[PDB]
Design an enzyme around this catalytic site. Structure first.
Site, short mmCIF file in Angstrom:
data_model
loop_
_atom_site.label_atom_id
_atom_site.label_comp_id
_atom_site.label_asym_id
_atom_site.label_seq_id
_atom_site.Cartn_x
_atom_site.Cartn_y
_atom_site.Cartn_z
N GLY A 265 -0.74 5.70 7.12
CA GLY A 265 -0.49 5.43 5.78
C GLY A 265 -1.33 3.99 5.46
O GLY A 265 -1.92 4.45 4.06
N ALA A 266 -1.15 3.09 5.94
CA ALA A 266 -2.03 1.88 5.47
C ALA A 266 -2.23 0.89 6.63
O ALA A 266 -1.62 0.66 7.72
CB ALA A 266 -1.48 1.29 4.19
N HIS A 301 5.12 -2.81 2.59
CA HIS A 301 4.90 -3.11 4.01
C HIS A 301 3.44 -4.08 4.46
O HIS A 301 3.60 -4.71 5.16
CB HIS A 301 4.85 -1.68 4.76
CG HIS A 301 4.60 -1.81 6.21
ND1 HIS A 301 5.79 -1.71 7.29
CD2 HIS A 301 3.70 -1.84 7.11
CE1 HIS A 301 5.21 -1.63 8.61
NE2 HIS A 301 4.03 -1.87 8.31
N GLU A 302 2.73 -3.44 4.05
CA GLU A 302 1.30 -4.14 4.07
C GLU A 302 1.28 -5.63 3.54
O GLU A 302 0.74 -6.59 4.26
CB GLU A 302 0.16 -3.67 3.75
CG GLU A 302 -0.06 -1.94 4.12
CD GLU A 302 0.36 -1.80 5.57
OE1 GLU A 302 -0.10 -2.55 6.39
OE2 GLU A 302 0.67 -0.52 5.88
#
Ligand SMILES: O=C(CC1CC1)N[C@@H](C(=O)NO)c1ccc(-c2cc(F)c(F)c(F)c2)cc1
Ligand SMILES: [Mg+2]
Ligand SMILES: [Mg+2]
Ligand SMILES: [Mg+2]
Ligand SMILES: [Mg+2]
Ligand SMILES: [Mg+2]
Ligand SMILES: [Zn+2]
Length: 889
Positions: A265-266, A301-302
């Protein structure tokens, strides 16, 4: 195959203080020059200096500017560079190297690679060694000074970590930029990006220090108009960390970059977060609704990693859940606050109890802190992430918000700027626990078992009420099944959030209460309980366990209608469905096994159907919750409860139950589908990408769920509604029109229409591929062959491959065709993908994870394909070690 063991951790005999990089990107190759300013650590015992370095072409290497000679002073075997210790200095020294790498052909998407026309890195976990020599482990913290040069016309935007301190022109149409990042960091947080990127930007002012932070979001030029929501989400993330946790961003600038080719995802590279485009880019005309929650959660999240992962980092990779479980928990708190919908928490539980519970009862079962690994690329599991998040969330349940925040601040203040272990977090939580209990002898030693013990606990209940004493008791037992990781399972610290519902008026009978179960069994007694209650158990899903509530369906119906806790209502419904599924499954199975000419099926409970109707018809009830109650539990949830599961019999079971309920409720479904239309499909804000209404999207989820039920039922003239739905501006609607038309002769007409709507946006086309792939079509295998020949072809883009094949693997009737042809097809895709991207090839093994839970014929068929894959002479390390573990070889 080298096995790394958690107990074997030892600090390095070396130190890397400064990294100075020159990365010169050319048409056919990239040259990387690196000077490492190094030292000898107190743990050194005169060993050889060994660098990780994978796939590097050495131009030269030197120590203190003296060229070393291959053979005499070093060896390189394409994995490790060994400098014999007689040539390693005894004090501070400089190691330098120049290597050649080739991002254009790096289709595994690890290290430095090319995604379309963007050069991009992915270094977590051990990808930095694919860029240059390093002691590639997260406890080797260093300062970074990075210069990138490239052709100016092809790569006008250059980015790395830290502050951009110089930009300069170079003869021959080239240019460079220099980035200095003084704070120490592990090498997995290094990143570089070069491309013809376009951006949106904003300035954010922090809450307390009032620092100005420049926010930049980048994409290729074609999709720059899809960046707005991501920027809004980044602002929301920063505010939430400030407001809940008191944490501010401390750097001048944060960049987010979308790329088309990404394994996951990232990634949280410091100041330079890099995203799968499908988790950063959206617009209302070219994205399904799911994208909006996805981008919110992934940007959040990141961002939350900047403290939990970046500022406080990992001593070693066995601590992965310390940053991932904790960041998922932070992400979940954020998303629950932003969406203000109960389905946000319910969706996380739904994922855990299907996908993660399956993993934890599979041969792959591991604790959230494993004891060993062979492949880090296979280590990033739903156990580590999602069970890890629930273990991190239980601290909040146990402590309450005020003391949880106190303990979290202790963790941040003690460990800011250093590496940490799971014990460090437990210690911080324990300090808050002592404060909450006003008892400095209290401890959380038992809590550490959540990190080391694998498997899902089972928690069961028995009840007693004495009407004369007004005394109620809840007797609780816990049990974890032995597995390959522990022969004897110890009891866990299990927090059980409970309420007591008065069945006569639906009101709460006690204040908020969290039972602390720390033994194999305990009895919890309540006095002054005026009537026999119905217990509301594990409110909010307060521990990651199998709940056995031992309630009657009458009691579960009462909770479903009248309880205050969304999860217990949803779980009570789930449990009613499961009792019905297991009963009908056994009846169908016996009829199959005994070749019966006639037999009986137990009907669906009529009061349960009445309760569904009651909730559906309540205008004050939540549309997202409604969509859950008309959906049977996920197949991957069901399979945890059936041995030797015959997927055909389960498909027949689901069909019977859906038809039983639809035969009573279809007119209600149709009435709601029509009445929801005005609010669900309101276009007032269609051209405002800052305006996102999660309630409205849940209304569309409900409409699209009801339409699916009505289409399967062949409700009279429902094809009229399907065709009109295909004209909706919202992709969630017009892609739903494609999938529900599968039951009608207009399917291929809508196939063509939606293809034409999707084909000119890369991400929308992938959503179209997923919709075709999951279509309930008898000719699905022929359809997949058409997608292969006409759309997918030989794409190496993981988003393309995953979109074509993974949704289809959830087709219970067709993927599990008794011929084994679906197993054969996915195994061919896995082997093909493994030649260029082993990480994604192993992701494509997901349908095989349940192999030993199926009926014996399908077990044999799946095992045959896995053994065929294992016999491929060119099998990757990733795929081999995964399949060896999965087949118990
Ligand atoms: O996006 C997600 C979803 C969760 C996995 C379920 N997780 C990412 C995350 O936590 N970002 O903060 C994430 C980022 C990089 C990797 C990664 C690891 C490797 F070893 C590689 F080689 C590689 F290329 C990437 C795996 C997951
Ligand atoms: Mg190479
Ligand atoms: Mg604010
Ligand atoms: Mg998430
Ligand atoms: Mg493409
Ligand atoms: Mg095994
Ligand atoms: Zn993460």
């Amino acid at each position: 195959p080298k096995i790394h063991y958690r107990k074997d951790y030892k600090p390095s005999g070396f130190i890397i203080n400064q990294v100075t990089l020159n990365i010169n990107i050319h048409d056919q190759e990239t040259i990387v020059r690196s000077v490492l300013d190094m030292d000898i650590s107190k743990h050194n015992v005169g060993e050889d200096l060994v660098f990780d370095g994978v796939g590097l072409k050495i131009n030269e290497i030197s120590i203190n500017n003296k060229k070393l000679v291959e053979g005499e002073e070093y060896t390189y075997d394409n994995e490790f560079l060994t400098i014999f210790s007689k040539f390693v200095p005894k004090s501070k020294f400089a190691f330098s190297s120049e290597v050649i790498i080739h991002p254009e052909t790096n289709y595994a998407l690890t290290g430095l690679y090319k995604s379309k026309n963007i050069i991009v890195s992915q270094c977590e976990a051990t990808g930095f060694r694919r860029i240059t020599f390093f002691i590639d482990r997260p406890d080797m913290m260093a300062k970074y000074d990075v210069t990138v040069t490239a052709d100016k016309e092809k790569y006008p935007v250059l980015l790395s970590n830290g502050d951009k301190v110089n930009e300069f022109e170079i003869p021959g149409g080239r240019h460079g930029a220099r980035f200095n990042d003084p704070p120490l960091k592990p090498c997995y947080l290094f990143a570089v990006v070069a491309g013809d990127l376009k951006h949106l930007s904003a300035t954010y002012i922090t809450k307390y220090t009032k620092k100005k932070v420049e926010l930049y979001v980048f994409s290729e030029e074609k999709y720059v108009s899809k960046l707005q929501w991501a920027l809004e989400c980044l602002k929301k993330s920063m505010a939430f960390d400030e407001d809940y946790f008191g944490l501010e961003y401390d750097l001048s600038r944060l960049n987010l970059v979308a790329v088309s080719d990404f394994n996951v995802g990232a990634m949280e590279n410091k100041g330079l977060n890099i995203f799968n485009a499908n988790s950063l880019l959206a617009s209302k005309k070219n994205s399904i609704d799911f994208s909006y929650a996805r981008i919110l959660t992934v940007v959040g999240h990141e961002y939350f990693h900047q403290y939990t992962g970046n500022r406080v980092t990992l001593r070693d990779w066995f601590q992965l859940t310390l940053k991932e479980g904790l960041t998922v928990h932070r992400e979940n708190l954020f998303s629950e606050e932003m969406t203000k919908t109960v389905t946000t928490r319910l969706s996380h539980v739904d994922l855990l109890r299907s996908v993660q519970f399956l993993e934890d009862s599979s041969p792959l079962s591991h604790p959230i802190r494993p004891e060993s690994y062979v492949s880090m690329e296979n280590f990033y599991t739903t156990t580590v992430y999602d069970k890890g998040s629930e273990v991190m969330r239980m601290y909040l349940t146990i402590l309450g918000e005020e003391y949880y925040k106190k303990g979290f601040d202790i963790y941040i203040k003690k460990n800011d700027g250093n590496t940490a272990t799971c014990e460090d977090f437990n210690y911080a939580m324990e300090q808050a626990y002592k404060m909450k209990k006003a008892d400095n002898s209290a401890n959380l030693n038992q809590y550490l078992l959540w990190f080391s013990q694998s498997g899902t606990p089972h928690v069961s209940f028995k009840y007693n009420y004495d009407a004369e004493k007004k005394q109620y008791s809840i007797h609780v037992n816990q049990y974890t099944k032995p597995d390959e990781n522990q022969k004897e399972k110890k009891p866990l610290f299990i927090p059980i959030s409970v309420g007591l519902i008065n069945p006569e008026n639906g009101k709460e009978m006690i204040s908020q209460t969290t039972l602390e179960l720390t033994k194999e069994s305990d009895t919890f007694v309540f006095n002054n309980i005026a009537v026999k209650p119905i217990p509301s158990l594990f409110r909010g899903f307060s521990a990651p366990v199998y709940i056995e509530d031992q309630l009657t369906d009458e009691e579960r119906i009462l909770l479903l209608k009248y309880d205050s806790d969304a999860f217990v209502r949803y779980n009570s419904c789930t449990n009613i469905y499961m009792k019905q599924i297991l009963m009908n499954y056994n009846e169908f199975l016996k009829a199959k096994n005994e070749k019966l000419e006639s037999f009986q099926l137990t009907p669906v409970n009529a009061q349960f159907i009445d309760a569904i109707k009651y909730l559906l018809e309540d205008p004050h009830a939540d549309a997202g919750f409604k969509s859950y109650i008309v959906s049977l539990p996920q197949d991957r949830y069901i399979i945890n409860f059936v041995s030797n599961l015959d997927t055909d019999v389960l498909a027949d079971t689901k069909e019977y139950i859906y038809k039983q309920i639809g035969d009573k409720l279809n007119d209600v479904y149709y009435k709601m589908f029509k009445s929801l239309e005005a609010k669900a499909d309101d276009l007032t804000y269609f051209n405002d990408e800052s305006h996102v209404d999660f309630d409205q999207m849940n209304m569309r989820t409900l409409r699209n769920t009801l339409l699916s039920l009505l289409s399967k039922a062949q409700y009279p003239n429902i094809l009229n509604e399907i065709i009109e739905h295909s004209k909706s501006p919202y992709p969630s609607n017009w892609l739903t029109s494609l999938s529900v038309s599968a039951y009608f002769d207009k399917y291929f007409e809508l196939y063509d229409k939606t293809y034409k709507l999707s084909k000119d946006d890369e991400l929308l086309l992938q959503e179209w591929l997923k919709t075709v792939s999951r279509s309930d079509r008898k000719d699905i295998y022929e359809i997949l062959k058409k997608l292969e020949n006409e759309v997918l072809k030989d794409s190496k883009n993981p988003n393309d491959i995953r979109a074509v094949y993974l949704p289809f693997t959830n087709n219970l009737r067709r993927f599990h065709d008794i011929s084994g042809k679906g197993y054969k097809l996915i195994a061919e895709v896995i082997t093909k993908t493994d030649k260029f991207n082993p990480m994604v090839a192993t992701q494509l093994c997901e349908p095989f994870k349940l192999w030993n839970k199926l009926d014996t014929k399908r077990q044999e068929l799946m095992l045959n394909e896995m053994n065929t894959m294992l016999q491929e002479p060119q099998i990757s390390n990733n795929l081999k070690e995964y399949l060896l573990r999965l087949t118990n070889k």
